[PDB]
Amino acid sequence: CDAFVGTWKLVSSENFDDYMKEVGVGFATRKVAGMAKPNMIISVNGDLVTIRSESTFKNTEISFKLGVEFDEITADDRKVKSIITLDGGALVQVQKWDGKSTTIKRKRDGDKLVVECVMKGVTSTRVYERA
Amino acid sequence: CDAFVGTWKLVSSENFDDYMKEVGVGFATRKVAGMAKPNMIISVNGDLVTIRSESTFKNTEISFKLGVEFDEITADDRKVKSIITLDGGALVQVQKWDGKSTTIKRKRDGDKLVVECVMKGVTSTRVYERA
Ligand SMILES: CCCCC/C=C\C/C=C\C/C=C\C/C=C\CCCC(=O)O
Ligand SMILES: CCCCC/C=C\C/C=C\C/C=C\C/C=C\CCCC(=O)O
């Protein structure tokens, strides 16, 4: 996934609060999340891919092998089971917890990196540009 | 309540989607509501006060006597029991349904009419100016 490697900064967000509402994020956490303009850093070392999100109030990091299910603690503190595969040139992530699931797709669009999150019909689109 | 009589147009809204989320309004209805820039029309005839909200997709109207509980069907289709009193120069409305309650205060601030809605700690502020 060489096309994803680098540091990206958030430029626009659409329906993110609605997505968080659907996932079940609390009011306070939703407000902090909506204020943050995180930087996403993606790197690859051998077969391990690392996706790091940095913001003044919270940094997250996940290192994984494409196709192998792993444990992830989300920014909003959910303990989920995640699997990320490379399909059609996009990184497709599925998070599962308490009988629920949500999909997060990270793809390239022109010179931008687009992240699309879907939870029960509600779709959020976040656009990132290179830092 | 002569200070309230007239036609008012929405100028600003703050935390309205969060308030609707707390009240339990569905995604589609929340999106339509957030797009509407309603006009509020208040009139008094004898001891009956009428508050009418007009928008391209939905008009609502309630006529009541201050201090007497009445039935109201909200824009989002809730069947509630409402009571409106005049306190400190403000119209204070309490809606009750299914063991829940929310407060809606309509007050004058300068030349503006401010509507504040509170549901379990979440507060929304909508400002109106004369049309
Ligand atoms: C990525 C989170 C940005 C905000 C961080 C601060 C607080 C987080 C609080 C709640 C976040 C809830 C869900 C976010 C999880 C995945 C979305 C990643 C979207 C992106 O990649 O943009
Ligand atoms: C007043 C509603 C404006 C939007 C109308 C269109 C659709 C309504 C759908 C859902 C509305 C849900 C709750 C609104 C009820 C009271 C808030 C009045 C606020 C104001 O006086 O602004």
Swiss-Prot record, chains A, B:
GO terms for molecular function: hormone receptor binding; long-chain fatty acid binding; long-chain fatty acid transmembrane transporter activity. It is found in: Cytoplasm; Nucleus. GO terms for cellular component: cytoplasm; nucleoplasm; nucleus. The modification Phosphoserine is found at S12. A fatty acid binds at R126, V127, Y128. Forms a beta-barrel structure that accommodates the hydrophobic ligand in its interior. Belongs to the calycin superfamily. Fatty-acid binding protein (FABP) family. This is Fatty acid-binding protein, adipocyte. It comes from Mus musculus. The gene is Fabp4.
